[PDB]
C-alpha cells in the first residue's frame, strides 16, 4: 500500500492502545544509533574543555573575591576549587565513557548529572546548544546503544549485534523536528518579517558572490530573512520523506557549514551536522562495513509525554509571569536564536544612606562577572539583595538603592526600561504575578520611525541625531560639553520644558519649536504633560566635525593655490593607517600562519586545562604544599609552550 509506503505506518495500529504499543516496539538495526553515539561522544570530549570553562575555572570561582551569584534557586551555592576541578572531572570521565561506550548506564549518569548541575548553577551562560546537549543526554540516557562497535562488545559476548526498538529512534527523530520547527515558527516575527534584525550582516565577505547577482538591499532582505525562514521550514520538512532525502540533507550541511564559519557559537553546528544523518535508513552503516509486556507500555508512555512535554515548553511563557520582561520570560529556552540584538548606553546607579540620609554614586559593573543582568528583572532583585547584603562591608548603613537603565531594542527610542524612584530592595517580586515596577514599551512610534528615516533624508551627513522618549514626571539631566559646538533640540511630542541651572531658568516648549542648547553647563528636560514625550537632540561635535571644517579650509586653500615633542593627532592617523594596512596584510596573508597560532593557542588552552586539573587532583589527594612551590607550578603552567 502506498500509505505505508510513504508515512511508514497504517491506521489500524492506531484504533487501540494494545494495537499501538505492538506497533511502537518492532526491532531494528543499531548502527546508525552508535554511529551518532560515537560522534557525540567524540564531540563532547572536544568540546568541554573550550566553551564550557574548564580552562578559565580558576578566575570564575577564584577564593576570597565575592561576586554576586545569579542561581536558579537561591539554595544554590557553588563549591569551593578543588571540589569543583573534581566535580569537572568526573563529567570528563562520564563523557569518555560515553565516548568509548563501555558502563553505558553509568557513564550516562555521571555525564547528565554534572551537565544539569552546571546548567542550573549560573543563569547569564545559558543559550540554545547547552540546552539541546542537556536534553540530548537525558533522551539518550536511556536508551541502548552499545550493541555495535563498541568496547562493552568486546568485553561481554550478550550484548554485541542486538536489536533496538523503534523508540529510541523516534524521541530524536522527534526532538530534532520539534527544534526546526519550534525555531521556523518563533522566526515569524513582527522584526523578522520587516528585515530590521540582523540588517548589518549582509556586509560579511562570505556573502560576496552573493552581491555579484543581486544588490545589497535584495541581498539582505530575500536572502538573510526569508530564505532562513525557508531553510529552516525545508529542514524541517524534507528530511522525512525519502524523495526529498540527499537534497534536503545537502541544504542542512550547506546551512549548517555556513552557519559554523559565519559566527561564533562554537561547536553547535558541528552537533547538528551529526544528528542530521539519522533520519535515513537505520542500515546505512551497515553497507560500509560489507502479548506485549509493561515495559512497551513505558516505551510509549515516555515518548508520548515527552514529545507533549516539549511540545508545549517552548510556548509556556504565559505562565512566568514574575520572569516576563519587555520582550518575553527568560532567554535561551525558547529556540529563537538571533531575533533581537541590544545597544546599552548608559547605566547609572544611586544609594542613600539609611542613618546619615547621604546620596552618593557606585560603580557601573562593580562586584559582577557578566553583561546580561541589563535587561532581567530577576536578575536586577538578585543583584540588589547581594548588595544590600554586601555593602555593610565599607562602612555604609542599610542603603536604599536606585537604578537607572537606559536601553534600546532593535534600533528604536532610548526609553526607560524600570522607574528609577522604587526601592528595589524593599520592593516585591513573585514567579506567579505580573509586576508592577517594569515601563511598558512604546510601540506607537514605530511608523514614525519612516518619518524619521524622513529626518535620517535630512541635513548634512556629518550631523547626528538621537531620539529620546521620555515618560511624564520624570527628568532628564545632561551634561552638553564645551566643544559640543551648534547643538540644539527639537520637540516632536508632547508639552516639556528646558532649564537652564547656571542662570536658573526654565522655559515651556511646544510642538515644532526649536531650542539651541548652551555649551559646556548642565542642562535638564522635564516632561509637564500627562502623556508621555517623544523629541530629537540634534547636535555634531566631534572629530568628524573638525576634521570637515579643516577638510574645507585645505579644500578652499588647495583650489585656491595649492595642492591637496611628539605629535599625537599624527601618530593616531598613522596607527588607524597601519591598522588599515594590517586588515589588508591579514587579508594577503596565507592561512597556514593563522591556522598555527590557533593550533598553538587551542593546544595552550588544553595543556592549562589539564595542568590545572592535575595541581588539584595533587592538592586535594596529597595535601596542600608551601606557596613558594604553588606559586612556582602556577607560573610553569600559565607558561606558553612554544
Ligand atoms: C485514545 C488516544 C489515542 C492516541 C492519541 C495520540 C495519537 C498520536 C498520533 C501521532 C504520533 C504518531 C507517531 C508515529 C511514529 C512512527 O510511525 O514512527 C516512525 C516514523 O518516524 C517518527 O517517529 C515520526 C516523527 C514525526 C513525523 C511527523 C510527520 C507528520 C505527518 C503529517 C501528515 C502528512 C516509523 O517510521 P521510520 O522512520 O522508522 O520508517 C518509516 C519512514 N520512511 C519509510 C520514510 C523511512
Ligand atoms: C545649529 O543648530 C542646528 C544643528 O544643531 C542647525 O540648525 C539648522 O539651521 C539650518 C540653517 O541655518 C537649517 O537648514 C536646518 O533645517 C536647521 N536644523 C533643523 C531645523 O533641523 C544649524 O547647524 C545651527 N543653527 C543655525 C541657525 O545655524
Ligand atoms: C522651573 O520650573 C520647574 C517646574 O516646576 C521647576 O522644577 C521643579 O523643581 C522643584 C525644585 O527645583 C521641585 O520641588 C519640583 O518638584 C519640580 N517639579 C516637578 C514637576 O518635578 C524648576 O525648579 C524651575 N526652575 C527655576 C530656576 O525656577
Ligand atoms: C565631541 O567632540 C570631541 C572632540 O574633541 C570628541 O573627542 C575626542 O574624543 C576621543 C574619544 O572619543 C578622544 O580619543 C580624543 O582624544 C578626543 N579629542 C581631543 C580631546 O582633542 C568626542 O568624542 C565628541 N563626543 C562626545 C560625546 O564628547
Ligand atoms: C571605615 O571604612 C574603612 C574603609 O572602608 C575601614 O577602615 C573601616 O571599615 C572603617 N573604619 C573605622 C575606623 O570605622
Known sequence: ??????????????????????????????????????????????????????????RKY??????????????????????????????????????????????????????????????????????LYGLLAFQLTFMDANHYWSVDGLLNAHRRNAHVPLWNYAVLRGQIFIVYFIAGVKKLDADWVEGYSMEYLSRHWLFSPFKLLLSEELTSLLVVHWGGLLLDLSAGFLLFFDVSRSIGLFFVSYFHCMNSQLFSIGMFSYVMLASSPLFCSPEWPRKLVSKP????????????????????????????????????????????????????????????????????????????????????????????????????????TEPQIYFDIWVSINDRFQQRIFDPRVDIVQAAWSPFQRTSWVQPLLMDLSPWRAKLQEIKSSLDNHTEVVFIADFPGLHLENFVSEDLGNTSIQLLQGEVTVELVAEQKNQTLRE??????????????????????????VYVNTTELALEQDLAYLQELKEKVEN???????????????????????????????????????????????????????????????????????????????
Not at 25 to 33: E, F, G, K, V
Not at 513 to 532: F, I
Not at 579 to 590: A, C, G, S, V
Open 1 to 58: 500500500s502506498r500509505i505505508g509506503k510513504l508515512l511508514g505506518f497504517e491506521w489500524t495500529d492506531l484504533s487501540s492502545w494494545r494495537r499501538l504499543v505492538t506497533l511502537l516496539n518492532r526491532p531494528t538495526d543499531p548502527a546508525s544509533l552508535a554511529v551518532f553515539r560515537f560522534l557525540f561522544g567524540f564531540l563532547m570530549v572536544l568540546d568541554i574543555p573550550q566553551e564550557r570553562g574548564l580552562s578559565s575555572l580558576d
Open 564 to 642: 591637496g615633542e611628539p605629535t599625537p593627532l599624527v601618530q593616531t592617523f598613522l596607527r588607524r593607517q597601519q591598522r588599515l594596512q594590517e586588515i589588508e596584510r591579514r587579508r594577503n596573508t596565507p592561512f597556514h600562519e593563522r591556522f598555527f597560532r590557533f593550533l598553538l593557542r587551542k593546544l595552550y588552552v588544553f595543556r592549562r586545562s589539564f595542568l590545572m586539573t592535575c595541581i588539584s587532583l595533587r592538592n586535594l589527594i596529597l595535601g596542600r604544599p608551601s606557596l613558594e612551590q604553588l606559586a612556582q607550578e602556577v607560573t610553569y603552567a600559565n607558561l606558553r609552550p612554544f
Open 293 to 396: 509486556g509493561l515495559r512497551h507500555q513505558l516505551g510509549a508512555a515516555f515518548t508520548l509525554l515527552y514529545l507533549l512535554e516539549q511540545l508545549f515548553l517552548p510556548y509556556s511563557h504565559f505562565l512566568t509571569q514574575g520572569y516576563n520582561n519587555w520582550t518575553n520570560g527568560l532567554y535561551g529556552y525558547s529556540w529563537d536564536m538571533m531575533v533581537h540584538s541590544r545597544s546599552h548606553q548608559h547605566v547609572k546607579i544611586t544609594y542613600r544612606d539609611g542613618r546619615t540620609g547621604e546620596l552618593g554614586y557606585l560603580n557601573p559593573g562593580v562586584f559582577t562577572q557578566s553583561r546580561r543582568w541589563k535587561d532581567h528583572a530577576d536578575m536586577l532583585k538578585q543583584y540588589a539583595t547581594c548588595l544590600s547584603r554586601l555593602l555593610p562591608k565599607y562602612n555604609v
Open 62 to 131: 577564584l577564593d576570597g573575591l565575592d561576586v554576586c551569584r545569579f542561581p536558579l534557586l537561591d539554595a544554590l551555592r557553588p563549591l569551593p576549587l578543588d571540589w569543583m576541578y573534581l566535580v569537572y572531572t568526573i563529567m570528563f570521565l562520564g563523557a569518555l565513557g560515553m565516548m568509548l561506550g563501555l558502563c553505558y548506564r553509568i557513564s550516562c549518569v555521571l555525564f547528565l548529572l554534572p551537565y544539569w548541575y552546571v546548567f542550573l548553577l549560573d543563569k547569564t551562560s545559558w543559550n540554545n546548544h547547552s540546552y
Open 512 to 537: 515644532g519649536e526649536k531650542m539651541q542648547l548652551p555649551a559646556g553647563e548642565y542642562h535638564k528636560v522635564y516632561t509637564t504633560s500627562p502623556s508621555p514625550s517623544c523629541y530629537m537632540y
